[PDB]
Amino acid sequence: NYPAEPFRIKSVETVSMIPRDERLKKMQEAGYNTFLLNSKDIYIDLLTDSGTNAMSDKQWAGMMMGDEAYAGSENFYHLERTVQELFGFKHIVPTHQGRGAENLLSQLAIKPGQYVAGNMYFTTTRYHQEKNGAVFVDIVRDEAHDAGLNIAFKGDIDLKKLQKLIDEKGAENIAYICLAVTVNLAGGQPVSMANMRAVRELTEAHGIKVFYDATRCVENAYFIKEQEQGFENKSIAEIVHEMFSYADGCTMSGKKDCLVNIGGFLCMNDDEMFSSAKELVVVYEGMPSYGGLAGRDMEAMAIGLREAMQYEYIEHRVKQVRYLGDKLKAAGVPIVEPVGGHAVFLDARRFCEHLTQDEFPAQSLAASIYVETGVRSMERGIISAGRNNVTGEHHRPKLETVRLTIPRRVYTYAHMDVVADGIIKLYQHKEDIRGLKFIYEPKQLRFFTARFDYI
Amino acid sequence: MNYPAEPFRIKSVETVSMIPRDERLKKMQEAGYNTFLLNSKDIYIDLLTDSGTNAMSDKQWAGMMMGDEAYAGSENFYHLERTVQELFGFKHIVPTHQGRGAENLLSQLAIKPGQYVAGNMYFTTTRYHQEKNGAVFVDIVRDEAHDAGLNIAFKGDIDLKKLQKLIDEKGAENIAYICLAVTVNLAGGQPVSMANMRAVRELTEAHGIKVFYDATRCVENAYFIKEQEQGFENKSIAEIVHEMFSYADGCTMSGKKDCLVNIGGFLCMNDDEMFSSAKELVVVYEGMPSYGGLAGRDMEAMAIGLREAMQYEYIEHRVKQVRYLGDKLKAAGVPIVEPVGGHAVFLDARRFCEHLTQDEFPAQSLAASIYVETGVRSMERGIISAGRNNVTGEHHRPKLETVRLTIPRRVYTYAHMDVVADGIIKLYQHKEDIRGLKFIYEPKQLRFFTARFDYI
Amino acid sequence: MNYPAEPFRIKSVETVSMIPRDERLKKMQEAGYNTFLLNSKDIYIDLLTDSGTNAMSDKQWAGMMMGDEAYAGSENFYHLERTVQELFGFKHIVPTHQGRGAENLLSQLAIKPGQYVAGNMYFTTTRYHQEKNGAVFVDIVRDEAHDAGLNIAFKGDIDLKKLQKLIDEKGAENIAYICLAVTVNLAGGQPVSMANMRAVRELTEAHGIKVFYDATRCVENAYFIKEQEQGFENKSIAEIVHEMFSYADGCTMSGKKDCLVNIGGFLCMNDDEMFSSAKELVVVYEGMPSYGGLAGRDMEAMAIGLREAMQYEYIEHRVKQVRYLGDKLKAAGVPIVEPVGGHAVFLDARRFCEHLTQDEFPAQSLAASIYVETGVRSMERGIISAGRNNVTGEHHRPKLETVRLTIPRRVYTYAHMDVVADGIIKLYQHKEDIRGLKFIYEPKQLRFFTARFDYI
Amino acid sequence: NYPAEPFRIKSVETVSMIPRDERLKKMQEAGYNTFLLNSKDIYIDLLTDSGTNAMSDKQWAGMMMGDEAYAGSENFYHLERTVQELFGFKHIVPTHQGRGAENLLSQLAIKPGQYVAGNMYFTTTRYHQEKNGAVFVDIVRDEAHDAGLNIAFKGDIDLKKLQKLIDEKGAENIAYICLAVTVNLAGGQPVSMANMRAVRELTEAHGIKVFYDATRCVENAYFIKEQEQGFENKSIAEIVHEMFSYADGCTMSGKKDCLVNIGGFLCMNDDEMFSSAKELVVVYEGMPSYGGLAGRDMEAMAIGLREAMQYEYIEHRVKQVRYLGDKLKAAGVPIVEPVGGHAVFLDARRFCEHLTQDEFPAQSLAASIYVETGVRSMERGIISAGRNNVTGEHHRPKLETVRLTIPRRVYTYAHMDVVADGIIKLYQHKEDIRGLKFIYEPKQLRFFTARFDYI
Ligand SMILES: CC1=C(O)/C(=C\N=C(/C)C(=O)O)C(COP(=O)(O)O)=CN1
Ligand SMILES: CC1=C(O)/C(=C\N=C(/C)C(=O)O)C(COP(=O)(O)O)=CN1
Ligand SMILES: CC1=C(O)/C(=C\N=C(/C)C(=O)O)C(COP(=O)(O)O)=CN1
Ligand SMILES: CC1=C(O)/C(=C\N=C(/C)C(=O)O)C(COP(=O)(O)O)=CN1
Ligand SMILES: [K+]
Ligand SMILES: [K+]
Ligand SMILES: [K+]
Ligand SMILES: [K+]
């Protein structure tokens, strides 16, 4: 049901343990915007699972063995061998993290005016597509947009929407299909092997390329192992390798499922594209053999990807997130369902139904959570959606959420209990949560530095 | 309140795994049914000891990169020295590689052949160093410390009536010193009260008798005082620690326990002449007074760790994590030493195995069976550890025949505790399957470390 | 005086070794005669670049254990931020993963298509980011910087007459900014004087033109100012650095050079609106303004390293070690760029190989031959690096056709320098054996990194 | 002649660089006793080569992999395998450093009244022999006592003295022969393979055991490679293994030739002695599988011993010391000859022949060296010999020396030049060096804390 950690603690990170009254002052000093809190003031930091993971003793040994050569580092060759074996692409180019790989892919693979279709999108990924002249098309199944619908493989592409696009626009006018595993925007929802194969088969008949956004591909493979018929005798490694067999390449943020603090990479099978990629990596990142990483980080990521293949590790990772979601759900706390691989999203609209979206319930709930528990969470609602700059109106998103994002191997079920118990107690007196109003709003990136006060 | 979450985050991890029961069976036999003789790789959760098995912090690992390895004058020595002077309040410090190295120095320096050393229950290496330097050991702990099931507070306390009697019957000049350990390891990690430390100092001082503390789990002990002794609820852990040592003439310390390191110890004293003599001796056994058989980076880690240990939330969690395991075991009717102590839960082997005699080594055997059935390693703390009476040659016979589930600091979670509890509860369902043991190889001293047995 | 000993001790080592000439020959062919394409394992002493190849200190490694990996609000970000604010004197900082990431931001933010960017000699990635954002590059370095053998001080200085002419012929509003690099890498690591920085600021300020520094080797540059510019002999390295940047509106920095790290860079500016815009852009390419595509531990290492770099003895030794190699080479009549610069000795390939034309790529070829004969890796810094004229499609033709023996900071000793000098002197004895090269594979930009050749 | 370092620098240790005037104050604050200087005030620290070595990147990787189990650590098994392969003993017991191993050996191998004979002695080694009731007998060749005699293998035992001892005392009355490699007291002098075999053969015929003090056995093996006929096609590893084939066991300080900062061990071939050793290690050190070391240090020492077998490494180590001695000798500076493996010893008696031994020329020369260069060196003369406590007279040693002891892989030839140039300049005006007199003298260990002032 919930397994014990399949690891023990080698070293600890010291935290302050400041009490509620002091947390309230820190929160006020941050203008009630959790993005403005200092890391040294936070007990449990669930802002993101990106780059916040705990490394192993074996990775730290690798950290001492950084061959820092500008070209031809042994660590690059270790990374390259590892990704070829595990993902099964012919070619790999390291990048400092995922968005560096996305910049490269989109410049290489898009002609202005072409469509890129995907199972929803991530903000950086879609931006790089659009900056290169692509029009984005959502081809996710309709269910993915229903946040209360508890169904499996909610990240699946709708083959009919793909077909429709090909019929209406023409294959030559589609740059590529961008299939993300898992689907972050839908709450971390997995994609099935059947769907990946069906997309490979249809695109292949039309000469259309498919590139994966692989950042949480290991969480994805765990869902396939757990829930997809016929994958129960298959190892995580076998699943991961089969998944990528249905792609022409990928962009990877190692900062997620490769269990590192920095690192990413671009893969492809096509020799000519690989050649062009090497011509471009040097402009933005570094050499084809470091790509904006220290040798020690290529080493840490090579070791971390291989650790991520262990079944017990990934089972525990996903079930720890599930434990938090299960406990919240059992107390009647409204969440996005089903719980995804990396986070639990509170539905702040329903949590704070005495407040209007214009009063920023997700922002305000995230502040309350920090004050009551020392937990930092991310606003993923009206604030982070930003303001229409043509009209000056808020972009008003359907999802008004607080993201409890879980770094890998950092926290225990007891820290999950701190988070849950705190949220449950807040829920019991939810009507007491107050609305927020801007007191400082920057013109851009407002979620990063906006300051608020209570209404 | 009852069970707080870890007051830290995980910075790095070590993988854990379990070999099949069939393989464990083979390994237990190959180790001659002594858990000390199993290999680390063959252990799933290793509760052999809290000694040297602690997880260090990121700050201690940063100190590890700043090892100043000079033979004399290292910054890491000065940092250790001023930290221990500040926190414990003794005048002088001599580092040693670990606690038994400091006990070697103390016993050689402070005992004349034929004298008595009186202590709140024996300890294994401690008693051996006393006895090998010609002392007779006298246990002056309260009787109640030897009754496993008796739930009373401050079980580690010295019985003043027994101390008084020793002085009367033997004369103060024939007592080398009082050895006061905090907490008391073999009583189950049981604390000593401040009132008792103060009373002991007062009695011994009037008679000119020296008192040397075994400081190895003094922070755990300070936690119990803050939690349970009336008047201390408001004092900081650090204030408690400093007051505790104000009632002593010096101490031995294994830093491998409450200083949160993997190696390290020291000897403290207030007396200038003893300091001089201790330095002459340290060079023979350990190294120059300026490193004491430690790398500079380990002095640094030990200085940093001892100060980390003073954080209330850290030590509250440390002790309550142990308590949680004991609570779950108790709830299922598993017999344990009570109350639960600072560093371990001690299964009561006499009750766990009523069908065996103490001469059939129930504790040694239970530890074997726990490993075979669960892949958890635990330690014998009974008749084998007690050693032999150095006059009659018979086994010492402790009332406490226990198996120790010892918890390294900052290493495991409550989920690991639940795994351990579950496996022990299961084994209890068939306790009568645990077989008697007999010696096949017996070392001449500290026999428990490497002795080998076979089933009767 | 002339050649000081290392002002540090060795804390840890990496082994070095040499594969036979026969094996090196094979490897050079397999790398298509481009030194960039050899493997690290196959190199004995690796002088390809001083970029990212530096040895960190014990203090920086201690900072590496204290990485605060938070996505926003990391202590390591705050430490970097206040360090750069203190030492460089700019209002705002945006970290980037390395220097070309900061050049991406600057060029996008500060250039309107069709504008001119004027600089003290081009640099490779710098010129590409200017040109790809629609700028025309204009070289305003003094003519003497392009003559390898001419031994004059402060060769990096901007020719004010050329700057003045640019403003006259093109109009100030059509100049996006002046790019002033310290030191000037491709001139041979040549410094810029304070007087010149002050004069440039004065001229540009009167016309409303912005000046952005390439800060990557500013500490080396400050060393030359202290050593050679009248009036500065008494100022600290840190004072020199802070004054230098007071003449700028912001900078790009590759921390991989003078900040003594293996990864890292940043963009600084004084202007609030530019800061806002830079943050919008950083999120697209690098990461959140609060880490900029760097682990927290690398921000920390870069903060610590930049402050280490201000120690006079450290930078005096850094530069004199380079000078020693150049001195030994000169003494034996080997043709080099003079005076020797801050980070490398640059062999003059035109003189080393008089028998070849620049169209036959003497520098690329010499670098190949050095590796084959010595197992030392060096870099082409000539016509291949210069790239193509983005209007005519012809090779840019630099007067400076050089091969760079680039010295990573705190990595090698004088004995390694002597090994390098000895091997190069030997190769010089048969310079006429070095054969012309021709392209077999040419990338569309920054071609030198991965191009492959074959002998004519 | 002098090779370049067969390594490059991975990381540096920061030092203060304080100037001459400030060094003079530090020296005065230390009462002119270099033992009292703070490490943070010293540029180049030549006090000892014990435990001061620079580790490699590979050792630091091993430092991150410490299996800290109290019993059965993987690191112990790695150490054990390595020592068995390289030294060729059947059994190994780890100890925290060399004197811990000596305590164990002497308790195991000596009955009160027995003789232990050796090629000179080391202070801790001889003390442990004597505390256990042994009488020490020097059986080194007479030449070893002539400090100006430049001959090879000066550490050799005189077989005739050994024979004489057996004849006069009886084999049953000799506990063992303690053969040290190299011989520290004679200036770091090596012992020949011929001598080790001859001693093995004579002792074997009489049933007498031989235990090596192996602390600088790798320096020793380098001398055999370099100078002993017939060892020129032999690897350092082959030499080391043959050396120990002539012993019944050894005590080792890894802090010397195993390239670590802490660590040591005891080896033996005899099963019964191994059993007894395991019974004793637990009293003083720890378990047979950690012996008073952290698991990470058993790992560092296992990796370091194997690194020490590399020919280029040990050739450079010994020749760097030689470089310093050669340069001093060429300027006419009086030194113990020939230069040993680990240090250069200045003859302070001849250096300061205007001073009497009672004026402490070695102590005073060591102070001058620090003041002029920031180099710390060790007094090895009348001060470190101590005072006769029966009579109160100085012990007056024949050797009045300053030891310039070189840690492995820490310094370069340039640092050797700082040391040499400074000493040479002092030598040029040697008559200016002033005598010292006590102002504070402890009753014991006076070299550690005595304070002086100028006469
Ligand atoms: C699905 C997906 C992501 O979730 C993603 C980054 N995620 C962040 C920063 C997060 O907080 O979820 C990126 C960008 O990776 P990067 O943050 O540049 O290494 C790409 N795809
Ligand atoms: C109270 C006390 C101890 O518990 C102790 C060692 N304890 C061990 C090894 C244990 O497992 O409890 C020692 C010896 O310390 P040492 O293991 O040598 O650092 C002294 N006193
Ligand atoms: C003056 C200057 C440089 O020298 C520079 C990079 N130099 C390299 C790679 C070199 O080998 O010189 C860069 C680019 O920095 P980067 O290599 O991207 O961190 C900018 N300016
Ligand atoms: C020949 C020899 C030595 O040189 C030695 C220690 N030497 C020191 C401390 C030195 O400064 O030379 C020891 C003692 O090793 P230890 O310092 O306890 O690891 C034994 N034999
Ligand atoms: K990070
Ligand atoms: K690097
Ligand atoms: K040391
Ligand atoms: K340990």
Query: D256 catalytic, yes or no?
Result: yes
Please tell me if the CB atom of residue C130 comes closer than 6 angstroms to any atom of ligand 3. no
For residue A178, what are its two tokens? 């961008």
Please tell me if the CB atom of residue D265 comes closer than 6 angstroms to any atom of ligand 4. no
- CATH classification of B1-57+311-455 is 3.90.1150.10, yes or no? yes
* φ, ψ of residue D79 in degrees (nearest 5): -55, -45
Please tell me if the CB atom of residue C181 comes closer than 6 angstroms to any atom of ligand 3. yes
- Residue owning tokens 């390294």: B408
For residue C119, what are its two tokens? 């600089």
Between CA A293 and CA A290 the distance in angstroms is: 5
Question: Bridge-partner residues for B282, per DSSP?
Answer: none
Pocket test for ligand 3, best of C254, C403, C405 (most atoms within 8 A of CB): C254
Which residues are placed with Cβ below 5 angstroms of ligand 7, an ion? B 69, 295; D 51, 261
Residues B21 and B352 sit within 8 Å (Cβ to Cβ): no
Q: What is the resolution of this structure in A?
A: 1.9
Q: What is the dihedral of CA B18, B20, B26, B28, to 10 degrees?
A: 40
Please tell me if the CB atom of residue C185 comes closer than 6 angstroms to any atom of ligand 3. yes
Kindly report the nearest CA distance between residue D15 and chain C, in angstroms. 5
* Active-site entry in B123, B212, B224, B324: B123
Chain B: residue whose CA lies nearest to A17: B7
Cis amide prior to C191 (ω within 30 degrees): no
Asked whether the beta carbons of residue B65 and residue C65 sit closer than 8 angstroms, the reply is: yes
The full set of domain ranges for chain B reads 1-57+311-455, 58-310
Chain C: residue whose CA lies nearest to A296: C262
Q: Residue B98: which of B311, B265, B336 has the closest Cα?
A: B265
First to last CA, chain B: 47
For residue C291, what are its two tokens? 């880490």
Between CA D156 and CA D163 the distance in angstroms is: 14
Please tell me if the CB atom of residue A99 comes closer than 6 angstroms to any atom of ligand 1. yes
Between CA B433 and CA A174 the distance in angstroms is: 71
Residues in CB range of B168: below 8 A, 6 or more apart: none
Max CA separation in chain B (angstroms): 62
Dihedral-angle region of residue C37 (phi above 0 means left; psi in -120 to 50 means alpha; beta otherwise) = alpha
Between CA C172 and CA A451 the distance in angstroms is: 40
Residues C403 and C72 sit within 8 Å (Cβ to Cβ): no
Question: Bridge-partner residues for D180, per DSSP?
Answer: D213
Residues C227 and C237 sit within 8 Å (Cβ to Cβ): no
Q: Which chains touch B (3 or more CB pairs under 8 A)?
A: A, C, D
Q: Residue B52: which of B100, B98, B104 has the closest Cα?
A: B98
Asked whether the beta carbons of residue A4 and residue B57 sit closer than 8 angstroms, the reply is: no
The number of the ligand 1 atom at minimal distance from the alpha carbon of A216 is 1
For residue A265, what are its two tokens? 């990479």
Measured CB to CB, residues of chain A less than 8 Å from chain D are: 57-58, 60-65
- Residue owning tokens 């620098």: D9
Identity of the residue in B42, B73, B283 whose CB atom sits nearest the CB atom of D37: B73
Asked whether the beta carbons of residue B62 and residue C58 sit closer than 8 angstroms, the reply is: no
Between CA C11 and CA D261 the distance in angstroms is: 11
Which residues are placed with Cβ below 5 angstroms of ligand 6, an ion? A 68, 294; C 52, 262
* Active-site entry in D322, D380, D403, D446: D380
Asked whether the beta carbons of residue C74 and residue A444 sit closer than 8 angstroms, the reply is: no
CATH class of D1-56+310-454: alpha beta
* Active-site entry in B96, B124, B216, B406: B124
Residue D361 burial by Cβ neighbours in a 10 Å radius (0-12, 13-18, 19+): buried
Between CA A52 and CA B86 the distance in angstroms is: 36
Residues of B in contact with D283 (CB under 8 A): 100, 125, 128-129, 132, 445-446
The neighbour count for residue C165, using CB atoms within 10 Å, is 13
Residue B5 burial by Cβ neighbours in a 10 Å radius (0-12, 13-18, 19+): buried
The residue count of chain A comes to 455
Question: Bridge-partner residues for A183, per DSSP?
Answer: A189
| DSSP-derived secondary structure for A187-215 | TSB---HHHHHHHHHHHHHHT-EEEEE-T
Pocket test for ligand 2, best of B220, B257, B294, B346 (most atoms within 8 A of CB): B257
Q: In Å, what is the CA distance from C284 to each residue of A122, A279, A450, C279, C422?
A: 12, 20, 20, 9, 49
Q: Residue B47: which of B409, B316, B452 has the closest Cα?
A: B409
Residues of C classed as catalytic: 71, 123-124, 214, 257, 381, 448
Measured CB to CB, residues of chain C less than 8 Å from chain B are: 58-59, 61-67
Residues of D in contact with B39 (CB under 8 A): 72, 74, 77
Coil, helix or strand at residue B128: helix
Question: Bridge-partner residues for A375, per DSSP?
Answer: A44
Strands C56-57 and D7-14: parallel
Asked whether the beta carbons of residue D61 and residue A65 sit closer than 8 angstroms, the reply is: yes
CATH code of the domain occupying D57-309: 3.40.640.10
Q: How far is the CA of C37 from the centre of ligand 6 (A)?
A: 16
- From the DSSP assignment, how many helices (H) and strands (E) are in chain A? 17, 15
Please tell me if the CB atom of residue C126 comes closer than 6 angstroms to any atom of ligand 3. yes
Sign of CA dihedral C96, C98, C102, C105: negative
Q: Write out chain C in H/E/C secondary structure.
A: CCCCCCCEEEEEEEECCCCCHHHHHHHHHHCCCCHHHCCHHHCCEECCCCCCCCCEEHHHHHHHCCCCCCCCCCHHHHHHHHHHHHHHCCCEEEEECCHHHHHHHHHHHHCCCCCEEEECCCCHHHHHHHHHCCCEEEECECHHHHCCCCCCCCCCCECHHHHHHHHHHHCHHHEEEEEEECCEHHHCCECCCHHHHHHHHHHHHHCCCCEEEECCCHHHHHHHHHHHCCCCCCCCHHHHHHHHHCCCCEEEEECCCCCCCCCCEEEEECCHHHHHHHHHHHHHHCCCCCCCCCCHHHHHHHHHHHHHCCCHHHHHHHHHHHHHHHHHHHHCCCCECCCCCCCEEEEEHHHHCCCCCHHHCHHHHHHHHHHHHHCEECEEECHHHHCECCCCCCECCCCCCEEEEECCCCCCCHHHHHHHHHHHHHHHCCHHHCCCEEEEECCCCCHHHCCEEEEC
Cis amide prior to D215 (ω within 30 degrees): no
The number of the ligand 1 atom at minimal distance from the alpha carbon of A125 is 20
What letters, b where the CB count within 10 A reaches 16 and e where it falls short, cover D243-269?
Answer: bbebbbbbbbbbbbbbbbbbbbbbbbe
Please give the helix or strand (H or E) that residue B266 lies within, else none: strand B265-269
Residues in CB range of A85: below 8 A, 6 or more apart: none
**Which residue has a Cα nearest atom 2 of ligand 3?**
C216
* Active-site entry in D32, D76, D231, D447: D447
| DSSP-derived secondary structure for B227-254 | HHSTT-TTS-HHHHHHHHHTT-SEEEEE
Kindly report the nearest CA distance between residue B299 and chain C, in angstroms. 16
Q: Residue A20: which of A12, A8, A28, A31 has the closest Cα?
A: A28
Between CA D55 and CA D76 the distance in angstroms is: 19
Please tell me if the CB atom of residue D257 comes closer than 6 angstroms to any atom of ligand 4. no
Q: Residue D284: which of D100, D127, D133 has the closest Cα?
A: D100
Residues of D in contact with C4 (CB under 8 A): 414
Coil, helix or strand at residue A240: helix
Q: In Å, what is the CA distance from C122 to each residue of A106, C184, C413?
A: 29, 9, 31
Q: What is the dihedral of CA A356, A362, A363, A368, to 10 degrees?
A: 110
Describe the crossing of helices A217-227 and A236-245 by its angle, rounded to 10 degrees. 110
Residues C428 and C366 sit within 8 Å (Cβ to Cβ): no
Residues D145 and D87 sit within 8 Å (Cβ to Cβ): no
Query: A447 catalytic, yes or no?
Result: yes
**Solved how?**
X-ray
For residue D269, what are its two tokens? 């071939």
Q: Residue D69: which of A440, B379, B352 has the closest Cα?
A: B379
Q: How far is the CA of B263 from the centre of ligand 8 (A)?
A: 6
Question: Bridge-partner residues for A11, per DSSP?
Answer: B12, B56
The number of the ligand 2 atom at minimal distance from the alpha carbon of B379 is 11
Q: How far is the CA of C288 from the centre of ligand 3 (A)?
A: 23
Query: A122 catalytic, yes or no?
Result: yes
Residues A211 and A176 sit within 8 Å (Cβ to Cβ): yes
Describe the crossing of helices C362-374 and C21-30 by its angle, rounded to 10 degrees. 150
For residue D340, what are its two tokens? 């040993």
Q: Residue A94: which of A319, A218, A260 has the closest Cα?
A: A260
Which residues are placed with Cβ below 5 angstroms of ligand 5, an ion? A 51, 261; C 69, 295
For residue D183, what are its two tokens? 């011989």
Q: Which chains touch C (3 or more CB pairs under 8 A)?
A: A, B, D
Q: Residue D272: which of A35, B441, A93, B410 has the closest Cα?
A: B441
**Which residue has a Cα nearest atom 13 of ligand 1?**
A98
| DSSP-derived secondary structure for D308-340 | HT-HHHHHHHHHHHHHHHHHHHHTT--B-SS--
Between CA D180 and CA D186 the distance in angstroms is: 11
For residue A338, what are its two tokens? 């089903």
The neighbour count for residue A33, using CB atoms within 10 Å, is 23
Query: B291 catalytic, yes or no?
Result: no
Strands B92-96 and B265-269: antiparallel
First to last CA, chain C: 47
The residue count of chain B comes to 456
Residues C350 and C341 sit within 8 Å (Cβ to Cβ): no
Please tell me if the CB atom of residue C212 comes closer than 6 angstroms to any atom of ligand 3. no
Please tell me if the CB atom of residue C369 comes closer than 6 angstroms to any atom of ligand 3. no
CATH class of C58-310: alpha beta
Residues in CB range of D219: below 8 A, 6 or more apart: D182, D188, D190, D257, D314, D317, D318, D340, D341, D342
Please give the helix or strand (H or E) that residue B376 lies within, else none: strand B376-377
Q: What is the dihedral of CA B308, B314, B320, B321, to 10 degrees?
A: -90
What letters, b where the CB count within 10 A reaches 16 and e where it falls short, cover D343-356?
Answer: bbbbbbbebbeebe
